[PDB]
């Protein structure tokens, strides 16, 4: 779809294309079915593969727009509660790994670097969202969901939380009676010191 680009009066839009059909979904029929093999048969490299659609990118639109902006959240979503509940338990660890899909929070792969992508789609620490990136600022209109949705790295607060949850979990198991009463709390150390 296209705006009237020859328009006389000045508008916030000057000219705007739409990729209406959002047929990127068809490539996703393919690759998503391929990932049906397994998780991690899902990849940020598939995220990178947005180039292989129309020679383009994955600034998604329509419900796929939503799924895209939700994309990491989609995956993270129960990890969120794997924290809420299961950081009191264990697979918080896995949730960490899943954040590590979204990002590299962990203390690792300094040398591997472009191992995780010769194109620097990722960054040493992918501080923005793996699909996403920073943008021009804007003037406010702001029901809370707007914030909950805002196109900004603030979301890293998540990682911060996750991390504190990790150490907090460790702290509680150390709240358990155990003569090795400092010991593995060293990880509480490592964590805290990571900030």
């Amino acid at each position: 779809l296209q705006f009237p680009e020859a328009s006389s009066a000045d508008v916030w839009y000057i000219g705007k294309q739409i990729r209406l059909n959002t047929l990127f979904a068809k490539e996703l029929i393919g690759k998503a079915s391929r990932s049906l093999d397994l998780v991690l048969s899902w990849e940020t490299q598939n995220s990178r593969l947005e180039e292989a659609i129309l020679g383009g990118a994955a600034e998604l639109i329509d419900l796929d727009g939503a799924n895209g902006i939700y994309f990491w959240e989609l995956f993270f979503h129960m990890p969120f509660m794997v924290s809420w509940r299961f950081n009191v338990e264990q697979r918080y660890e896995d949730a960490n790994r899943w954040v590590k899909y979204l990002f590299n929070p962990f203390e690792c792969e300094d040398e591997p670097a472009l191992l995780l992508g010769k194109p620097p789609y990722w960054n040493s620490r992918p501080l923005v969202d793996e699909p996403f990136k920073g943008y021009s600022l804007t003037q406010p209109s702001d029901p809370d969901a707007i914030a909950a949705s805002d196109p900004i790295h603030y979301r890293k607060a998540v990682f911060n939380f996750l991390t504190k949850n990790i150490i907090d979990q460790g702290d509680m198991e150390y709240r358990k009676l155990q003569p090795s009463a400092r010991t593995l709390a060293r990880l509480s150390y490592s964590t805290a010191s990571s900030l």
């Binding site: 203390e107 690792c108 792969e109 300094d110 040398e111 040493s124 620490r125 501080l127 790295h153 010191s193």
Partner: peptide, 29 residues
């Protein structure tokens, strides 16, 4: 150095305080 050196880049917002509108809620004006 140490392998995979730690780097919590607290990216520089140069964090500075922000006004509550509840204080001076009259801004509702």
């Amino acid at each position: 150095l140490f392998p995979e050196p730690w780097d919590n880049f607290c990216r520089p917002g140069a964090i500075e305080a922000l006004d509550s509108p509840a204080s001076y809620l009259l801004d509702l004006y």
